[PDB]
């Protein structure tokens, strides 16, 4: 006794094994392989990346499962020196198989960029400041004519979760000072990212970068630091 106390089921080891088998039976039918640690990417951005080349096979799943599928070490390598890819991959398990030119693929990956919310630990693009009056959906960064005042329903979340001196005046969220969330180049915390997500402002830009590349028939790994 005294132990601790929906219609979607769990995938589990069955789906892990299915993904592993799919990777094993599909890797050999391509020319180049790329590993990317897409830590934080919106679903529309991921869909755009996928549709950029419908002929490229996207692969993802558990890091350990993908490492086992590719061969954790030389003893289990699916291809010669392919275990180097698993050894050198440490972030998110983004993976891609392609037949397009390596130079073209890496150039496209480097060029790709999309607006997004500044994630924690990133420098502040600008000195975001909520004005000293009625707050708006866009945080007051645009004129009130083009902005809509924030509704009081989420006022407690601003007051407590985001720790700002918001208050209710005639049902409108307001602050008594030009509340700056961060200064230029300041390191953002989780609170700033949450505030930016609430305001729906794409503070910064994100571009997917390849962590490592692999050539199949040559069976060789390589580094491509396209930041």
């Amino acid at each position: 006794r005294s132990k601790r106390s929906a219609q979607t089921d769990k995938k589990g080891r069955e789906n892990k094994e299915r993904i592993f088998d799919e990777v094993r039976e599909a890797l050999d039918t391509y020319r180049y392989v790329w590993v990317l640690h897409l830590d934080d990417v919106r679903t529309p951005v991921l869909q755009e990346i996928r549709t950029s080349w419908a002929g490229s096979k996207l692969i993802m799943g558990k890091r350990k499962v993908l490492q086992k599928a590719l061969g954790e070490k030389r003893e289990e390598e699916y291809k010669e020196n392919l275990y180097q890819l698993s050894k050198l991959c440490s972030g998110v398990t983004g993976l891609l198989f392609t037949d397009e030119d390596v130079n073209t693929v890496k150039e496209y990956f480097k060029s790709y960029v999309r607006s997004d919310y500044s994630r924690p630990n990133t420098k502040a693009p600008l000195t975001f400041t909520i004005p000293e009056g009625i707050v708006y959906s866009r945080g007051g960064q645009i004129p009130a004519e083009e902005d809509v005042p924030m509704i009081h329903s989420l006022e407690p979340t601003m007051r407590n979760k985001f720790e700002i001196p918001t208050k209710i005046k005639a049902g409108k969220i307001t602050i008594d000072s030009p509340y700056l969330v961060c200064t230029e180049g300041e390191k953002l915390d989780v609170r700033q990212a949450l505030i930016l997500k609430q305001f729906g402002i794409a503070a910064s830009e994100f571009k997917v970068k390849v962590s490592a590349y692999y050539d199949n028939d040559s069976s060789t790994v390589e580094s491509t630091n396209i930041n």
């Binding site: 219609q7 089921d9 009081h152 407690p156 407590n160 209710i168 049902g171």
Partner: protein, 71 residues
């Protein structure tokens, strides 16, 4: 009272500055309060509480089974 005063006051000024926190704390405490009430409240009140708890447990089990079968 213009037919909506109760909701108008909430929508124009909101609840207490910590009403949500107090409600959450009370909900968390309800877990131990249920056991406290079960142990205490002897007599006809205790019998009624036990019967109500058994009925609620049976209803919850039936609802969970129906939800699982609806898949």
């Amino acid at each position: 009272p213009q037919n909506d005063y109760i909701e108008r006051h909430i929508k124009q000024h909101g609840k207490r500055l910590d009403h949500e926190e107090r409600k959450r704390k009370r909900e968390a405490r309800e877990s131990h309060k249920i056991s406290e009430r079960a142990q205490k409240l002897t007599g006809w009140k205790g019998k009624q509480f036990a019967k109500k708890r058994y009925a609620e447990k049976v209803s919850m089990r039936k609802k969970i089974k129906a939800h699982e079968q609806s898949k």
